Amino acid sequence: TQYPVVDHEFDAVVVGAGGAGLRAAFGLSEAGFNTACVTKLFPTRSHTVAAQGGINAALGNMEDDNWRWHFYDTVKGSDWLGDQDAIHYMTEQAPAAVIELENYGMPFSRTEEGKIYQRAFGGQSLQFGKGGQAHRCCCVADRTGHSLLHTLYGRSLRYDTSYFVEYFALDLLMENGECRGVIALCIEDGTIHRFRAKNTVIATGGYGRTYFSCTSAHTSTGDGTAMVTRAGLPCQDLEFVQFHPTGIYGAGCLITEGCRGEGGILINSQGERFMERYAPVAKDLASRDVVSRSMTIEIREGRGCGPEKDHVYLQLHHLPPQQLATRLPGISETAMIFAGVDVTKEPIPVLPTVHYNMGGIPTNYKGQVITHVNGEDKVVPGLYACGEAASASVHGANRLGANSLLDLVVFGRACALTIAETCKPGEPVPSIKPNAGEESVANLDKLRFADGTIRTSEARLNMQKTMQSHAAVFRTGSILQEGCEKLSQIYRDLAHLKTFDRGIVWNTDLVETLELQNLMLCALQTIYGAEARKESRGAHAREDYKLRIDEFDYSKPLQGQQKRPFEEHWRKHTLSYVDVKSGKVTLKYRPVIDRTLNEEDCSSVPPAIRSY
Amino acid sequence: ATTAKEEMARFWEKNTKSSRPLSPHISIYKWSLPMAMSITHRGTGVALSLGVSLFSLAALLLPEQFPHYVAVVKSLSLSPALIYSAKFALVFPLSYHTWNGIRHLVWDMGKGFKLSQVEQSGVVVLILTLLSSAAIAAM
Amino acid sequence: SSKAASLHWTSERAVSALLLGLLPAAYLYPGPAVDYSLAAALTLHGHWGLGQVITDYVHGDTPIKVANTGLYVLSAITFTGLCYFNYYDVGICKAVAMLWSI
Amino acid sequence: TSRIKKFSIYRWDPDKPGDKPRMQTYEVDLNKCGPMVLDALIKIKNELDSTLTFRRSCREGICGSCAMNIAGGNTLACTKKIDPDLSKTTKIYPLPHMYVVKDLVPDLSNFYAQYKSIEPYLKKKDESKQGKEQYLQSIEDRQKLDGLYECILCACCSTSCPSYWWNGDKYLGPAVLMQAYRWMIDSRDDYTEERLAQLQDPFSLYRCHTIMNCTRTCPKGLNPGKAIAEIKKMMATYKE
Numbered sequence A: 001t002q003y004p005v006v007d008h009e010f011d012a013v014v015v016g017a018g019g020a021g022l023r024a025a026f027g028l029s030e031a032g033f034n035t036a037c038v039t040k041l042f043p044t045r046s047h048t049v050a051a052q053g054g055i056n057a058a059l060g061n062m063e064d065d066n067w068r069w070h071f072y073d074t075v076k077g078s079d080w081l082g083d084q085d086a087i088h089y090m091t092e093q094a095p096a097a098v099i100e101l102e103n104y105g106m107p108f109s110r111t112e113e114g115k116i117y118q119r120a121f122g123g124q125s126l127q128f129g130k131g132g133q134a135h136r137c138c139c140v141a142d143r144t145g146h147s148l149l150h151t152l153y154g155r156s157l158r159y160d161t162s163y164f165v166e167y168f169a170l171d172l173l174m175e176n177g178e179c180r181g182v183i184a185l186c187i188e189d190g191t192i193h194r195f196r197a198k199n200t201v202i203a204t205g206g207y208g209r210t211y212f213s214c215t216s217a218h219t220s221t222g223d224g225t226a227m228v229t230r231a232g233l234p235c236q237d238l239e240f241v242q243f244h245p246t247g248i249y250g251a252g253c254l255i256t257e258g259c260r261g262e263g264g265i266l267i268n269s270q271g272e273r274f275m276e277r278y279a280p281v282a283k284d285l286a287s288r289d290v291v292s293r294s295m296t297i298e299i300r301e302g303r304g305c306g307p308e309k310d311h312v313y314l315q316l317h318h319l320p321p322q323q324l325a326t327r328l329p330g331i332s333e334t335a336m337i338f339a340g341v342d343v344t345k346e347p348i349p350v351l352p353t354v355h356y357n358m359g360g361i362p363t364n365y366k367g368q369v370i371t372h373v374n375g376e377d378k379v380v381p382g383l384y385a386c387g388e389a390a391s392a393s394v395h396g397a398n399r400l401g402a403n404s405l406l407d408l409v410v411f412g413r414a415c416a417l418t419i420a421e422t423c424k425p426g427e428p429v430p431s432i433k434p435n436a437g438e439e440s441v442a443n444l445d446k447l448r449f450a451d452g453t454i455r456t457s458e459a460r461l462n463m464q465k466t467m468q469s470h471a472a473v474f475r476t477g478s479i480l481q482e483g484c485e486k487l488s489q490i491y492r493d494l495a496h497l498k499t500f501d502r503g504i505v506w507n508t509d510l511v512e513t514l515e516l517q518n519l520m521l522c523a524l525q526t527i528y529g530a531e532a533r534k535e536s537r538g539a540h541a542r543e544d545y546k547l548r549i550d551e552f553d554y555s556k557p558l559q560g561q562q563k564r565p566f567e568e569h570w571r572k573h574t575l576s577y578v579d580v581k582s583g584k585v586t587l588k589y590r591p592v593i594d595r596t597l598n599e600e601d602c603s604s605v606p607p608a609i610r611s612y
Numbered sequence B: 001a002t003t004a005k006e007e008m009a010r011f012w013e014k015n016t017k018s019s020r021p022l023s024p025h026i027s028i029y030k031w032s033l034p035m036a037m038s039i040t041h042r043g044t045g046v047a048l049s050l051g052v053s054l055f056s057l058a059a060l061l062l063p064e065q066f067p068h069y070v071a072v073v074k075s076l077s078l079s080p081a082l083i084y085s086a087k088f089a090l091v092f093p094l095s096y097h098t099w100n101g102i103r104h105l106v107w108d109m110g111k112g113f114k115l116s117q118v119e120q121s122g123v124v125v126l127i128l129t130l131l132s133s134a135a136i137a138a139m
Numbered sequence C: 001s002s003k004a005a006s007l008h009w010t011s012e013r014a015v016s017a018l019l020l021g022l023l024p025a026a027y028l029y030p031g032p033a034v035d036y037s038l039a040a041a042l043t044l045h046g047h048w049g050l051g052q053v054i055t056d057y058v059h060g061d062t063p064i065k066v067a068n069t070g071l072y073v074l075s076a077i078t079f080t081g082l083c084y085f086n087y088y089d090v091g092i093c094k095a096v097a098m099l100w101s102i
Numbered sequence D: 001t002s003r004i005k006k007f008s009i010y011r012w013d014p015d016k017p018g019d020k021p022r023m024q025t026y027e028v029d030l031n032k033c034g035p036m037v038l039d040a041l042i043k044i045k046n047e048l049d050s051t052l053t054f055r056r057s058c059r060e061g062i063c064g065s066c067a068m069n070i071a072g073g074n075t076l077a078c079t080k081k082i083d084p085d086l087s088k089t090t091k092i093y094p095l096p097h098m099y100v101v102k103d104l105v106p107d108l109s110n111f112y113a114q115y116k117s118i119e120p121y122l123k124k125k126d127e128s129k130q131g132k133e134q135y136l137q138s139i140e141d142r143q144k145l146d147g148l149y150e151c152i153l154c155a156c157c158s159t160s161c162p163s164y165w166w167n168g169d170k171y172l173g174p175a176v177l178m179q180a181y182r183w184m185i186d187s188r189d190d191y192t193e194e195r196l197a198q199l200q201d202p203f204s205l206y207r208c209h210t211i212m213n214c215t216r217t218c219p220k221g222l223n224p225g226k227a228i229a230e231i232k233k234m235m236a237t238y239k240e
């Protein structure tokens, strides 16, 4: 091709520089591995920077805690689609992960003992669901992700990690089922780069921008998810999309769940704190899937607020202004800028907003990416994934608030740890065929010079409005099917794309056309997996299949129950595949892992009724 | 795996030899009174210095001494308006720079850094400068 | 010292303060003592101040050394002439009074 | 039924040989646009000119990506209200006195290298004990970091400082200096004196002549001028 291809050789290459990628990247250098971090954004612009409410750790700073209580909250929160071995690892590691962050310099808020301040957060209890509200969300006021990312970035400057900032990863370099590295575009100068490495770590974030309204950054476009799909690998549980209860109305910006953790309440057009009726015990601190469904029924039934009766109010003003200024200063500023609301006098208009992707690239608990052949998992040699892009799956069907930033640092560090115990630095870099990756250049060059009927921004909008109405909080079979048809037609319509910018240096016309390819691969698997999952679990609610369907009826004594066969129940992960030429999705399924790392230390939690 | 010094030197190597433009600045940036007052503190500072050094050079080089050149000017029987305007023009930079100098020495204590206080002390400097100049040029 | 830069910043402020105090001293107790103290402070303050202007605006090792060497010459000649004026002529305070009686 | 607002935006293309900077005017119906200038730039890119190039990501003023010069002042395009006075054309420029990569995208890597240079990370003498326990820090000592840690490194303040315009090669600028102070007064940090020592030269800190443009321009409401003045007070008083 007419593109000068620059070859690099590293021990490891990390794609992404959010919480996950930063912690994996310098963890590897710390372990003595010559590491490259490839990121399309400067590291502190990553969506992690926008995170507010905090990061969970059973530190016991506000009361006596126990990481196995956090374990149980997360398992019950996941609605038993979560892998309990990964969840065991994530909640046991949490105190040491958050202590690591503080010792790095993270300016956590403080208690009167001088320790890390922790707040209540949604769906977290003491004594395995029986002992009341837990306070283990460690926070830097309501700017926790901002401070976590700047702390992690500042820490990474002490190691010899080679950074390749504003490089856009295009595809993995696969040979014989193993990953040999990544091929990427240097945005600053237009050149193509192949990064050969023994191990690759994918920490590329979520894909909330498949929807019309999200809290997510413009850059949350599922790029590492799509590279996996294009490599012929499965993605997992992509139909499980988290609607955060409180995105600010209109702009969509996140108003943290810490507002409810500190005392904020939701009220409708009648002033009722309606969560007292939907969730008698947890009220406004129920799980997000439950609070989002609640808010949604109040609106469509007919008790929405505002001149259009299409949102609800997040009331903070009954709380002391000094608490609001110490605990919630960030959203106080954002509510004024993006809604003109002064939080000490008037409520914040909020509605369920696409926020987070439970699904991702399937991994084991060590960070290694897996495929699934003939009923057994098979690690993909050389390929790892952590953070929102990954499906460990610590979150299953519904993530607990403040578990993601934890996930970021626990499994970012796990990838570093696992490579450290598995490989040595300096091992021979694997050869790539001389033309490895040239189909990514050919695709990029066809998009650079595309000149059809449907400009990129027009097709992106057709995708976002199609996901927004056909794959929302509540779903039915007929609506999901028509969204599958609309998406598949949009995906073929990509043959009609038109770009205008024929340059190669900082051509965001072309890069955003690449993100649209990425976004659509994510969107197809999301909505087709949704249409096929004929049950209600976590954030996936079918009104034509309102029940959770597990291998037993766990709402009854199990003695004398005929166990449902794997193919006749839904307590299993969705695995999704895309033939990238056609756009055709194929679905397979793999079992949920119910065992922990140590039954004597941490009991496996069997399915149960799930109420807040 | 580059140090900050290497990154800095690579930046200048790369950019000073490139075809890249320097984006505009003085021609496009919007004015404020603090900014205009910072420029004026520099300009009156330099003007006072250069005037102090001219006086010193005239002391070393003029054929006659000071009271002659004063008597010369008194003989010209100049108008009070022209005397007043000249005096004002002479004391005004000294006055401006002294008060704004005081405002700077406050800043060096860490006081007055809220932006609305930067505006208040600026205007306070303007009115003390105007009052002291008009009064001294009437002495 | 290896604290040269902050000792300089502190001296700048010390000398500026001195010169402030000389202005009432010149109006109140004019004479030889204030004349020569004004000669010293006026020259020191102006010299340091013009060196900040040069540091800001002049770049390159040779223009920097040229600018600064000329500044020493300007300052040295300035202090010399002000002392000359104070010894052989009427001095600073008296000169201002005479000017202001025009 | 419409309110047409005019934007005049700085344009340059490195892939055009001999391209000289120009300004291009776009008309935008404010009734079909969000309230912020970034919303206008995204609308223009999607609907009128997909060649218009700029950095953006978070659209809520927290990532720092979209710093540019709007209506004469450095701000975040995503939190800068569109000026609805239709008689006025809004002029949009890159951050001032920077090498322009393309259109509204400046090369920020010297800025990034100056931040790296002050070692923006907690340092302790005995670091053998890190990873074991949380360091203690009082509520009072944590309060000292308020107004310093919120910085988003957008470079709005530094690229508004005339000192950084003439000596950005050697003067760290208000952003990086306020972060040096953020670590100097972190009560957990043990290198306060080494961090001051590093600023003992004519340029790194002492090109600051208190112009106060940094504080006027900061979109987070922070005060780097005040922070630079507390650094200066510490420089003159500490003992080796």
Ligand SMILES: *Cc1cc2c(cc1C)nc1c(=O)[nH]c(=O)nc-1n2C[C@H](O)[C@H](O)[C@H](O)COP(=O)(O)OP(=O)(O)OC[C@H]1O[C@@H](n2cnc3c(N)ncnc32)[C@H](O)[C@@H]1O
Residues within 6 Å of the ligand: A015, A016, A017, A018, A019, A020, A021, A038, A039, A040, A041, A042, A043, A046, A047, A048, A049, A050, A051, A052, A053, A054, A055, A144, A145, A167, A168, A169, A170, A203, A204, A205, A206, A215, A216, A217, A220, A223, A224, A254, A355, A356, A386, A387, A388, A389, A401, A402, A403, A404, A405, A406, A408
């Ligand atoms: C949207 C959001 C999420 C959020 C939150 C607030 C908001 C507004 N608050 C949270 C909180 O208080 N507590 C918590 O546990 N989670 C919270 N979240 C969710 C959470 O922040 C995210 O799930 C998480 O931060 C994601 O982190 P991760 O490291 O996995 O990914 P990222 O920060 O999105 O960064 C992605 C990086 O990957 C690089 N990238 C992306 N595409 C490419 C390509 N094509 N090539 C190269 N690199 C790529 C990006 O540059 C970026 O650095």
Ligand SMILES: CCCCCCCCCCCO[C@@H]1O[C@H](CO)[C@@H](O[C@H]2O[C@H](CO)[C@@H](O)[C@H](O)[C@H]2O)[C@H](O)[C@H]1O
Residues within 6 Å of the ligand: B031, B032, B033, B034, B036, B037, B040, B096, B115, B119
């Ligand atoms: C010796 C004489 C030296 C001083 C005289 C020079 C006169 C020229 C000054 C030019 C000042 O120009 C003017 O400054 C003011 C006040 O800071 C600016 O005002 C700006 O800041 C203030 C608050 O700080 C806001 O109230 C206002 O809405 C804003 O636009 C205004 O946009 C600018 O147009």
Ligand SMILES: CC(C)Oc1cccc(NC(=O)c2ccccc2C(F)(F)F)c1
Residues within 6 Å of the ligand: B025, B026, B027, B029, B030, B031, B035, B036, B038, B039, B041, B042, C056, D162, D163, D166, D207, D209
């Ligand atoms: C856009 C305009 C109003 O803005 C400008 C333009 C040119 C110079 C300046 N102001 C200085 O040049 C100045 C003034 C006083 C003290 C120190 C300086 C210094 F250090 F050099 F930056 C401001």
Ligand SMILES: O=C([O-])CC(=O)C(=O)O
Residues within 6 Å of the ligand: A051, A052, A053, A054, A244, A254, A255, A256, A257, A258, A356, A400, A401, A402, A403, A404, A405
């Ligand atoms: O997603 C999370 O973990 C929590 C979040 O956005 C919030 O602060 O409400």
Ligand code: SF4
Residues within 6 Å of the ligand: D150, D151, D152, D153, D154, D155, D156, D157, D158, D174, D175, D178, D217, D218, D219, D220, D221, D222, D224
């Ligand atoms: S200080 Fe204010 S303006 Fe300067 S970089 Fe940080 S946030 Fe951006």
Ligand code: F3S
Residues within 6 Å of the ligand: D160, D161, D162, D163, D164, D173, D174, D207, D208, D209, D210, D211, D212, D213, D214, D215, D224, D225, D228
């Ligand atoms: S504008 Fe510049 S000169 Fe100092 S006070 Fe701010 S860094």
Ligand code: FES
Residues within 6 Å of the ligand: D038, D055, D056, D057, D058, D059, D060, D061, D062, D063, D064, D065, D066, D067, D076, D077, D078, D079
């Ligand atoms: S786009 Fe993140 S600050 Fe404007």
Ligand SMILES: [K+]
Residues within 6 Å of the ligand: A357, A358, A359, A360, A387, A388, A389, A390, A391
């Ligand atoms: K995920």
Ligand SMILES: [Mn+2]
Residues within 6 Å of the ligand: A493, A496
């Ligand atoms: Mn067709």
